[PDB]
Each structure stands twice: as C-alpha cells, then as structure tokens.
Design a protein around this ligand. Structure first.
Ligand SMILES: *[C@@H]1O[C@H](CO)[C@@H](O[C@@H]2O[C@H](CO)[C@@H](O[C@@H]3O[C@H](CO)[C@@H](O)[C@H](O)[C@H]3NC(C)=O)[C@H](O)[C@H]2NC(C)=O)[C@H](O)[C@H]1NC(C)=O
Ligand SMILES: *[C@@H]1O[C@H](CO)[C@@H](O[C@@H]2O[C@H](CO)[C@@H](O[C@@H]3O[C@H](CO)[C@@H](O)[C@H](O)[C@H]3NC(C)=O)[C@H](O)[C@H]2NC(C)=O)[C@H](O)[C@H]1NC(C)=O
Ligand SMILES: *[C@@H]1O[C@H](CO)[C@@H](O[C@@H]2O[C@H](CO)[C@@H](O[C@@H]3O[C@H](CO)[C@@H](O)[C@H](O)[C@H]3NC(C)=O)[C@H](O)[C@H]2NC(C)=O)[C@H](O)[C@H]1NC(C)=O
Ligand SMILES: *[C@@H]1O[C@H](CO)[C@@H](O[C@@H]2O[C@H](CO)[C@@H](O)[C@H](O)[C@H]2NC(C)=O)[C@H](O)[C@H]1NC(C)=O
Ligand SMILES: *[C@@H]1O[C@H](CO)[C@@H](O[C@@H]2O[C@H](CO)[C@@H](O)[C@H](O)[C@H]2NC(C)=O)[C@H](O)[C@H]1NC(C)=O
Ligand SMILES: *[C@@H]1O[C@H](CO)[C@@H](O[C@@H]2O[C@H](CO)[C@@H](O)[C@H](O)[C@H]2NC(C)=O)[C@H](O)[C@H]1NC(C)=O
Ligand SMILES: *[C@@H]1O[C@H](CO)[C@@H](O[C@@H]2O[C@H](CO)[C@@H](O)[C@H](O)[C@H]2NC(C)=O)[C@H](O)[C@H]1NC(C)=O
Ligand SMILES: *[C@@H]1O[C@H](CO)[C@@H](O[C@@H]2O[C@H](CO)[C@@H](O)[C@H](O)[C@H]2NC(C)=O)[C@H](O)[C@H]1NC(C)=O
Ligand SMILES: *[C@@H]1O[C@H](CO)[C@@H](O[C@@H]2O[C@H](CO)[C@@H](O)[C@H](O)[C@H]2NC(C)=O)[C@H](O)[C@H]1NC(C)=O
Ligand SMILES: *[C@@H]1O[C@H](CO)[C@@H](O)[C@H](O)[C@H]1NC(C)=O
Ligand SMILES: *[C@@H]1O[C@H](CO)[C@@H](O)[C@H](O)[C@H]1NC(C)=O
Ligand SMILES: NC(=[NH2+])NCCC[C@H](N)C(=O)O
Ligand SMILES: [Zn+2]
Length: 902
C-alpha cells in the first residue's frame, strides 16, 4: 500500500465546499530584486469517509501560519482532531496534514493558512507581467491557473471536478484596479495597517473549478456596454490601447456572441458580468477564466488603421472560442484532463458558429476545413498519432496533463464534433447539448454523458435514423487514431475504407479494438445534385448504386468535407470532375473545389494517385475566383516550391503559376477599381491577398509594378502609408526584393519606429526579401543584437532569411558558424533552437546537403543542441525523406510543368 501523499490523484475522502482567499501582490521588488505575493486562505470541506490525513495541493508556497502550516477548526459544533504535523511533499505538490485522530463522515471543517510565494514572471499561478508605458516599466499582477497552477497561488483541492464557491479578496495599491471572476462587492476600503493599500472584496463565485479562477491588479482601463438583460460587458487594456480605440472591435462582437451562445445552448449566461482583458505578451494566447477571460493583446485588440482582415478574423474567432467555454467547460466541466479533447474540441468547433453570428456575411464556418480539418489530418495520417481518448488512469502528472493540449485534442476534436452535429443535424445536436448542460450544470461529466444526452435526442424523434448508437459510432472516431481514405470505383459503385497514412511504407504498431475500420457518414453529390445520405458500416468493402456512374456522369463524396475522411476515385471519375471544374465550376460547392486539391495531393504523397493527377486538379484554377480552392493549391504546392526552387523545375513551375493566377489578378485589378477599394466580404479579401501574393512571388510583371509603385509612393510620403494592411506583407516584400539599400534602409527605419507588433512583424519579414547577399548578411548580423532585434524575434528573423532562396546558404552558414551560442542562450532566455533548425534545414533534399547536416552534427562534443536536440534528429530524418521524394518526383513534375506552362 503506497502512502496517499505519494499518489498524484487526490483522495476522495474530503470534498471542498467553499474557500475564502485573500491575495496581496507586492509590485515593488524587495531590492534583492524579488517580487512576492502574500495570501491567507480558509477552505471549508466536508468529510465523506473517515480519515486521519488532509491532503491538499500546494506548489511553491512558503507557510507563515501561526503554529503548524495550517490551523484546523470544526464547523458549527464539530470537534476537530489535533494536528500531529504538517509537511510539504514537493513531487506530488501536496500540503499534508497528519492528524492525531480521524475526521468524521458528514462533518465539515475549516482549514486556515497563511502563505507567500514569488510573484514570478513565469506566466503560472499568480504571477507578474512587465511592460512599457513611455519611459516607465509598468508591472501588473495576474493569473494563469490552467491546468494545475491554482495550487501555486493558494492551497486548494486542485482537480477540476472538486468544485466549490470562492470568496476572493485582493489587497492592492489604492490607485490600481482589482478584477476577479465576479463583480466587486462594492467600493474598495483602505487597508487599516497601511492606507496606501486598498481592499477589494468580490461577490461569491458560482460553484466552479479552481483552474478557472482569475484575479488581476493593474492600471488598466476599459470600454463598456450593458447588454439588454443587464449583463455588463467590458474590454480591459493598457490605458494607451483603450485611448487609441483598439478595444472597440472586441466590444462590438462580444454582445452578439454572448447572445448567440445563450440561445445556442438554450441556457442563460451564468454570470452577472463579462470581463475580457488584453495582456501584453501573454504567451498562453487566451484563457477562458469564468467571468474574466485573458488574451494576448494581439488576439483581442484591433487597430483598424494598421490591422489586416485576417487580424480581424483572429479577434472575432478567439473571442467566440473563449466565450463558448463560459457554458461548455466552465458551467459543465469535464471530470478529468483525459477528456480535454471534448472541451477544447467543442470550443474549437463552435468558435466558428459564434463568430459567424457576429460576422454573418463572412462565411466563417467554411474556414474550419482549411483551419482545422486538413491541418490535423497532416499529423493524424501518421503512425505516431494517438486516439482522441486516453484512459483517465494514464493521465496523472502535471506533465501528462499538459500533453493533452495538442493539435489532435483541439483540431481533430473540432472535426469529429462537427461531423457529429452534421449527421445528427444541428437542431438535434442542439437539443441533446441543451439537455446535457441542464442536467450537469455546476457539476462534472465524461464524454459518455454527452453521447447519452445526444442519444436521448435521437431516441425522441423519428426523422434521423443511425446505423448504430451515437456511442458506438463515436467510439470508432475517438478510441482509435487516424481516419480512413474512402475509395470509390464508379464503374461498379464499389466503395472501400482503409486507415490512411501519408507514408505508404509506414508500420502502424498501435493496435485498434476495431482493426482500423470506421462507421462513416457519407454524403454525395451527383452531377451537382445532392444524393441520399449513406452510411458505410464497419466493413472493408461495400457496394451502392449511389456511387455508380454513367460514362458522362460524375459523383463526389463528402459534401463540404463534413466527414473526417479523404476520398479517392477511379481515374475516369477524376477526369469527369476535372472537366466539370473546367467548364462550369459553380456546380461543385466551393469547399469541395478545395477538397479535390487537398485530398489528391495527400493521395499522391501516399502513392494512391500519380502526382500528375494532383497537378491536373489545379488546372481549373485559372477560372477560380474564390479563396479556398486557391488556398488548397498554395498549401499543397509550398512543398514543391521548397524542394524545387533552386532547380530546373522552378522556371516551368513559376510560369505555370503565372499563367494560372493572371486572370485572378486581372479580375481584382478591375473589381478593386485599380486597387483603391478592397472587396467587401472576408473570403474575397482573402482571395485578393493570396492572388497578389501568388502573382508577385511568381514574377508577374503587373504585380511587380504595383508593388514598386506603392512602395515608391510610401517612400516619398513616409507618414501616409498608401498600402492597405491586407496587402502589406506582399507589397513590402516584393518591393524590397526589387530595390536595393534605398528600399532596405527605409523599411529598416520604419521597423525601428514601429509602435505596433503586427506592423513590426511584416517589416521584419519583408526585410528578408532583399536579393542582395550583402544586405541579407548585414541583416543576419543584426539578429543577435537585442538593441536592433528583440531576442524573442531572432530565430524568426533568421528563418525568414533562410526562406529567401538567396538567403538559404547565408542563414545556414550563419547558424553553423554561431552555433557556439548555445552556451549563451540555453541560459539567457529560451530561444527555439528547435524552430531554428527546422526552418534552416527545411529545404535540404540532396545527399550532399545530408552530408553537411551530418558534418554539422559533429559539434556533438560539448555545447550539444539543447532544446533542439530532438529537432536535429528530425532534420536528418526529413532530409532522407526529401531526398527520396525528389528522386521519385523530379522528372514527372518537371515535364508536367513544362507541358502546362505554354
Ligand atoms: C469568509 O469571508 C467572509 C467575508 O469576510 C466572512 O463573513 C463575514 O464575517 C464578518 C466578520 O466576522 C461579518 O461582518 C461583521 O462582523 C462583525 C464582527 O464584529 C459582526 O458583529 C457583524 O454582525 C458583521 N456585520 C454585518 C453587517 O453583517 C459578516 O457577517 C460576514 N460577511 C458575510 C457573511 O457576508 C466569513 O466568516 C469568512 N469565512 C470564514 C470561514 O472565516
Ligand atoms: C521561501 O523560503 C525559501 C527558503 O527559506 C526562500 O528561498 C531562499 O531565499 C533565501 C533568501 O532570499 C536564499 O538564502 C540566501 O539569501 C541571502 C540574502 O538574501 C543571499 O545573499 C544568498 O545568496 C542566499 N543563500 C545562498 C546559499 O545562495 C536562498 O537561496 C533560498 N533558500 C532555499 C532553500 O531555496 C524563498 O525566498 C521563500 N520564498 C518567498 C516567496 O518568500
Ligand atoms: C464597431 O461598430 C460600429 C457600429 O457598427 C462601427 O462604427 C462604424 O465605423 C465605420 C468605419 O469607420 C463608419 O463607416 C464610415 O466611415 C467613413 C468615414 O468618413 C465614411 O465612409 C462613412 O461616412 C461612414 N459610414 C457611413 C454609413 O456614412 C461608421 O460611421 C460607423 N457606424 C456607426 C453606426 O457609428 C465601428 O467601425 C466598429 N468598430 C470596429 C473596430 O469594427
Ligand atoms: C463565501 O461567502 C458566502 C456568501 O457570504 C458564504 O455563504 C454563506 O455561508 C454561510 C455559512 O455556511 C451561510 O450561513 C450563508 O447562508 C451563506 N450565504 C449565502 C448567500 O450563501 C460562504 O460561507 C463563504 N465561504 C467561506 C469559506 O466562508
Ligand atoms: C500609482 O501610484 C504610484 C506611486 O505614486 C505611481 O507609480 C510611480 O510613477 C512614477 C512616474 O509617474 C515612477 O517613476 C515611480 O517610480 C512610480 N512608483 C513606483 C513605486 O513604481 C503610479 O504612476 C500611479 N498610477 C496611477 C494610475 O495613478
Ligand atoms: C430553451 O428552449 C425552449 C424551446 O425553444 C424555450 O421555450 C420555448 O419558447 C418558445 C418561444 O416562444 C415557446 O413558443 C415554446 O412553447 C417554449 N417551449 C417550452 C417547452 O417551454 C426556452 O425559452 C429556452 N430557454 C432559454 C433559457 O433559452
Ligand atoms: C461530479 O459530477 C457528478 C455528476 O456527474 C456529481 O454527482 C452528483 O451529485 C449531485 C449533488 O450531490 C447529485 O444530485 C447527483 O445524484 C449526482 N449524480 C451522480 C452521482 O451521478 C458529483 O458530485 C461531482 N463530483 C464532485 C466531486 O463534485
Ligand atoms: C466489386 O466487389 C465485388 C465483390 O462483392 C467484386 O466481385 C466479386 O469478385 C470476387 C473475386 O474473384 C468473385 O469471386 C465474386 O464472385 C464477385 N462477386 C460478385 C460478382 O457478386 C468485384 O470485383 C468488385 N469490383 C471492383 C473492385 O471493381
Ligand atoms: C456547403 O457549404 C456552403 C457554404 O460554403 C453552404 O452554402 C450556404 O448555405 C447556407 C444555408 O443554406 C446559406 O445561408 C449560405 O448563404 C450559403 N453560403 C454560400 C456561400 O452559398 C451549403 O449549404 C453547404 N451544403 C450542404 C449540403 O450542406
Ligand atoms: C515496415 O515493415 C515493412 C516490412 O514488414 C517494411 O517494408 C518497411 O521498410 C518497415 N519500416 C518502415 C520504417 O517503413
Ligand atoms: C453554371 O452552373 C451554375 C450553377 O449551377 C448555373 O447557375 C449557371 O447557369 C451555369 N453557368 C453558365 C454560364 O452556364
Ligand atoms: N497549452 C495551454 N495550457 N494553453 C493555455 C490556453 C488556455 C485555453 N484553454 C486555450 O485553449 O486558449
Ligand atoms: Zn479553449
């Protein structure tokens, strides 16, 4: 019998009722330079089963309590046992209170403690964040409890299912504002011991999880709205950001998104107010703390004068995501971190629904396909993938919990939930979802509970019929990794499924309970007309006349890619689809025009079609106006650019892409009235952005000339930037590529005085587009200078230079030569040797380059490679793969491009 304090999961003998917590950050260092916070807490808990030990989480807290580390009292007239001793057990992050007798079932106890910790700049628990306002370094105090860091701010039963109410008090400088999950009780009062401090008490939370607590002390200011039901909505930011109006977009969209979700969930927003706060350099991106959601600035703030449309899209979707959680995840909470995929998958899906409500003309819901589906399919089509579900008993340590937060959890979670909603229909999905939220409000669940409530909705109607239970179907998609390729022979209507792997030689060693067979919902369109829905059962092979065609007809599966799978056809059907896209593309839904490209390039990779069939699938693009199919092509061909852009293949490739994109360029030139006005909706703006990028990077003279004119014009009038933020990255880059030290020095000046990160980013990246070796080398020479290049930007900048075909050898030489700055930046901040290595070696595709990477590896003796040790192995592995791919593909690809370029 192991001792319970040496087990990672808490006992279930004691359950918390409510906490009082008082925190007091000291935002002035103690002159050895240490920042601290002090706290006092009382937890009231109920004894379920007798026990002579109290085990509660504590991390990096020193205790100053009088006596033992806690004082223990009975509630009401309960007696309490004497404390034997209190100890801290660091490994399992416990405060352990050994008692001289047993606590008694049904009795409640209160445990009081006093403590302090470092207010570290470490983005964990209660922590400090430093930023600049003019001359002054400002310091604020804020929180990040997710996942297991509430215990770093005060002792608590720090597991998501052990919910409780919290009464938070902040003691803070009297001229700063204090925020928490709930509204303040009233005006702050002076701290009697020192009236330079004030005390702000907050209203009692609902019953909630510790990982969702938040509290913040800052000089921040807000923009406000009161919704019709009296819910107060505020956006908080740096005084200067608020004054510039950068909070207005967030405020604009928040009301509509909250309204959408209350109706979507059939459940009122469960709090009296909604605060969202933009934090400078919040590396975690955003966190859904209940009533007080935190964001990195660039995720919440928006500058209409400098921000592109894609920035706007990022703001509305991240807001929709975090707000989605205020019901799904916060009101009803998954019992344990092994079910994180459901929480994060659900939010990652409905973020598009919420954002769509706020921006109904943008067709946002479509973007889940490129954004999540095909993104996660890249990693889920590997032997090294993993099922959405993990046994709860395998997820114990804080490191194991952190591993839950990955692409599979978010993006495959989103993809499968979206599939589920689609085959249930949204109305039916919403009924079960509402039933689930009502039944489990303020409590905890597993994914099985959601399946059960969805099944209840299915059972209560007669319209939607499923081939099996919701659970049995979703089991196929959650208990085994990966996804099928569905292959159709349209001569017979034979249809098959098999586990899809990009590497046709891969060995899958992870076994599945289902032999990698799925139950697959299959929609289809024949000659542009919707067909009856079909389910492929858990069989290798089936037949249906739905998928049988005449000679002059075509069929296409997985309308709008609602289903988490990819599709192959016989060549005849492929050609018929190709001629349709050639002659009238609007018969096929825009998402499917993209699908044909996405799937066919993946199939070519996996040797299931020839690479020329994938290329053939791009031939229609010369008539394509819309964003997604072009995006499909650009994403699929970026590897071809990477392998071939230094080879004889590249001229014919550029020529073919010039041919394809010219009509699109001409279309927008007219539509935008000579580039003076952007297209109206988001998709068309995105298409314009890509069309200009593609034209300019492939050397279309008309785009090159546009880029030179605008940049000339900006240089003659530096304070009036004539280039729309949408087009800035391309126009900057192409213009600097055409120009010399005049253009380069000017853009450098503008980088030095850029007050906005997004604009600094674009300039930094464009500066790497110069075609002068000496400019790129001098630039590389700056990247280690923290004066001229922020350290957090150094590897990014080197990678951008590596990306330049002329900068490739320069960056590689520079990284090798100054590698002996591992002993200067595995200590002086983090870095990302890993991201540096991948970027600089990304192109390597010959034996000779592999010989160089091996030779570079022989500075193994000392310094080593740090956090990129694993990366350098991945680079030798990827170069081998690239060598093999280029040998296989070079001849067939060269001759296709020659043939199709005119
Ligand atoms: C968790 O925090 C709560 C808020 O501080 C505590 O409840 C408060 O206790 C206060 C002081 O004990 C009470 O305020 C006043 O106290 C004086 C003592 O001199 C009493 O006579 C007054 O009756 C009382 N004043 C008023 C206007 O009620 C509060 O009653 C009380 N606040 C509440 C209940 O909202 C909890 O006790 C504390 N929990 C634990 C376990 O200590
Ligand atoms: C929680 O308690 C810890 C242990 O008491 C504290 O960590 C200790 O900080 C000490 C004081 O800052 C350090 O001791 C010495 O302090 C003198 C004067 O400040 C320094 O000149 C010395 O460098 C330092 N001693 C040595 C050997 O270097 C300790 O380094 C450190 N002790 C341990 C065991 O980690 C925490 O400060 C305290 N935390 C908070 C937030 O209160
Ligand atoms: C938050 O929502 C607000 C209300 O919908 C938006 O306010 C709108 O800002 C528009 C963009 O500046 C304005 O449109 C036009 O602006 C120029 C200025 O000269 C002119 O073309 C037009 O005269 C003007 N619009 C019209 C219809 O004439 C609107 O003035 C304004 N609308 C309202 C109702 O005030 C905010 O833009 C929005 N904030 C963000 C960041 O999106
Ligand atoms: C946090 O504050 C709440 C609200 O004041 C406290 O809830 C009260 O609990 C007391 C003692 O159990 C009851 O007598 C009252 O009926 C409760 N009031 C309300 C409005 O619910 C709660 O006890 C506090 N938590 C702690 C640890 O003291
Ligand atoms: C809140 O009070 C503090 C102290 O009065 C102010 O912070 C000082 O500001 C000056 C410049 O204005 C700095 O040089 C000092 O070093 C600061 N003191 C400390 C201890 O940091 C602060 O400006 C006030 N803030 C507001 C919003 O009124
Ligand atoms: C949850 O949804 C139900 C069903 O839409 C809502 O109750 C219905 O409200 C409509 C609106 O006029 C009535 O016509 C129906 O008769 C109601 N049905 C029932 C069974 O009551 C309810 O308003 C929603 N609740 C929330 C909080 O959004
Ligand atoms: C975790 O959630 C479950 C529900 O999924 C909670 O169990 C419920 O407790 C409430 C209030 O005591 C009862 O009304 C229900 O009968 C329970 N439902 C069950 C047992 O299925 C459970 O209390 C939560 N766990 C913790 C530690 O709070
Ligand atoms: C379509 O599937 C059917 C199997 O249901 C295939 O036809 C069978 O092929 C086997 C293999 O020799 C014959 O022995 C069976 O008698 C056939 N079944 C029949 C005719 O009902 C057919 O080959 C498949 N067509 C494809 C894959 O294009
Ligand atoms: C496939 O996706 C398209 C969107 O790309 C869907 O078209 C939308 O349909 C909804 C509801 O009918 C309309 O409100 C939108 O205005 C449509 N948008 C566009 C751009 O046409 C289409 O309904 C989807 N097809 C299927 C079978 O689900
Ligand atoms: C996987 O096993 C098969 C032989 O059964 C082989 O073709 C292949 O080379 C093996 N390894 C890899 C990494 O593909
Ligand atoms: C092509 O098909 C579209 C959509 O089905 C139809 O509206 C249109 O008539 C066709 N366009 C032409 C030019 O025939
Ligand atoms: N990997 C993390 N722990 N990220 C924390 C961010 C929190 C939030 N749950 C999100 O998905 O944005
Ligand atoms: Zn989330």
């Amino acid at each position: 019998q192991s001792k319970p304090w040496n087990r990672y999961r808490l006992p279930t003998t004691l359950l918390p009722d409510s906490y009082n917590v008082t925190l007091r950050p000291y935002l002035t260092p103690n002159a050895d330079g240490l920042y601290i916070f002090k706290g006092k807490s009382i937890v009231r808990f109920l004894c379920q089963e007798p026990t002579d030990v109290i085990i509660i989480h504590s991390k990096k807290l020193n205790y100053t309590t009088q006596g033992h580390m806690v004082v223990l009292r009975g509630v009401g007239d309960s007696q309490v046992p004497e404390i034997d001793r209190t100890e801290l057990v660091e490994l399992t992050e416990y405060l352990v209170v050994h008692l001289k007798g047993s606590l008694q079932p049904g009795h409640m106890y209160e445990m009081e403690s006093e403590f302090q910790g470092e207010l570290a700049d470490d983005l964990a628990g209660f922590y400090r964040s430093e930023y600049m306002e003019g001359n002054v370094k400002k310091v604020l105090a804020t929180t990040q409890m997710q996942s297991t860091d509430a215990r770093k701010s005060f002792p608590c039963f720090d597991e998501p299912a052990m919910k409780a109410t919290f009464n938070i008090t902040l003691i803070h400088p009297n001229n700063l504002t204090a925020l928490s999950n709930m509204p303040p009780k009233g005006s702050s009062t002076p701290l009697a011991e020192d009236p330079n401090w004030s005390v702000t008490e907050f209203e009692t939370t609902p019953v909630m999880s510790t990982y969702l607590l938040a509290y913040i002390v800052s000089e921040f200011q807000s923009v406000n709205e009161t919704a019709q039901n009296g819910v107060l909505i505020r956006i908080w930011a740096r005084p200067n950001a608020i004054a510039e109006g950068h909070g207005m977009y967030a405020l604009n969209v928040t009301g509509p998104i909250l309204n959408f979700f209350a109706n979507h969930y059939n459940t009122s927003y469960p709090l009296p107010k909604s605060d969202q706060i933009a934090l400078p350099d919040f590396n975690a991106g955003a966190m859904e703390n209940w009533g007080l959601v935190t964001y990195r600035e660039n995720a919440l703030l928006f500058d209409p004068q400098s921000s592109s449309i894609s920035n706007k899209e990022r703001v509305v979707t991240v807001i929709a995501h975090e707000l989605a959680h205020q019901w799904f995840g916060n009101l009803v909470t998954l019992a344990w971190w092994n079910d994180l995929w459901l929480n994060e998958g659900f939010a990652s899906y409905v973020e598009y629904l919420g954002a769509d409500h706020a921006e109904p003309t943008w067709n946002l819901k479509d973007l889940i396909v490129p954004g999540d589906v095909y993104r996660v399919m890249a990693v889920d089509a590997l032997a090294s993938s993993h099922p959405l579900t993990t046994p709860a008993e395998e997820v114990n340590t804080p490191a194991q919990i952190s591993e839950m937060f990955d692409s599979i959890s978010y993006s495959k979670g989103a993809s499968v939930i979206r599939m589920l909603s689609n085959f249930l229909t949204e109305d039916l999905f919403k009924e079960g979802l509402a039933s689930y939220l009502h039944a489990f409000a303020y409590q905890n669940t597993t994914y099985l509970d959601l399946w059960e409530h969805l099944q209840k909705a299915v059972d209560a109607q007669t319209s939607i019929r499923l081939p099996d239970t919701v659970r049995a179907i979703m089991d196929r998609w959650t208990l085994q990794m990966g996804f099928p390729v569905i292959t159709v022979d349209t001569k017979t209507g034979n249809i098959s499924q098999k586990h899809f792997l990009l590497d046709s030689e891969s060995n899958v060693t992870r076994s599945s309970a289902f032999d990698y067979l799925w139950i697959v919902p299959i929609s289809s369109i024949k000659n542009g007309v919707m067909q009856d829905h079909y389910w492929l059962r858990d069989v290798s092979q089936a037949q249906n006349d739905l998928f049988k065609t005449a000679s002059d007809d075509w069929v296409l599966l997985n309308v709008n890619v609602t289903g988490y799978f990819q599709v192959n056809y016989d060549e005849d059907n492929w050609r018929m689809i190709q001629h349709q896209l050639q002659t009238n593309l609007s018969v096929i839904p825009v998402i499917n025009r993209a699908q044909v490209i996405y799937d066919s390039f993946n199939l070519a990779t996996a040797h299931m079609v020839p690479v020329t069939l994938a290329l053939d699938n791009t031939l229609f693009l010369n008539g394509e106006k819309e964003y997604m199919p072009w995006q499909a092509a650009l994403s699929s061909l970026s590897y071809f650019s990477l392998m071939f852009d230094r080879s004889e293949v590249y001229g014919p490739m550029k020529k073919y892409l010039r041919k394809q994109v010219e009509p699109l360029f001409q279309h927008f030139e007219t539509l935008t009235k000579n580039w003076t006005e952007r297209p109206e909706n988001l998709m068309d703006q995105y298409s314009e952005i890509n069309a200009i990028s593609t034209a300019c990077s492939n050397g279309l003279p008309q785009c090159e000339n546009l880029a030179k004119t605008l940049f000339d014009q900006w240089m003659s009038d530096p304070e009036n930037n004539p280039i729309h933020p949408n087009l800035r990255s391309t126009i900057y880059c192409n213009a600097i590529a055409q120009g010399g030290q005049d253009q380069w020095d000017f853009a450098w000046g503008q980088l030095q005085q850029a007050q906005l990160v997004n604009e600094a980013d674009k300039l930094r990246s464009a500066l790497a587009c110069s075609n002068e070796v000496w400019l790129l080398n001098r630039y590389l020479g700056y990247t280690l200078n923290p004066d001229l290049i922020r350290k957090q930007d150094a590897t990014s900048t080197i990678n951008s230079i590596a990306s330049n075909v002329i900068g490739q050898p320069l960056a590689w030489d520079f990284v090798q030569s100054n590698w002996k700055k591992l002993f200067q930046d595995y200590g002086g901040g983090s870095f990302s040797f890993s991201n540096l290595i991948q970027g600089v070696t990304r192109r390597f595709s010959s034996e000779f380059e592999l010989q160089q990477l091996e030779q570079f590896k022989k500075n193994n003796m000392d310094v080593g490679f740090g956090s990129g040790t694993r990366a350098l192995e991945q680079a030798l592995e990827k170069t081998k793969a690239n060598i093999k791919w280029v040998k296989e593909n070079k001849e067939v690809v060269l001759n296709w491009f020659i043939e199709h370029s005119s």
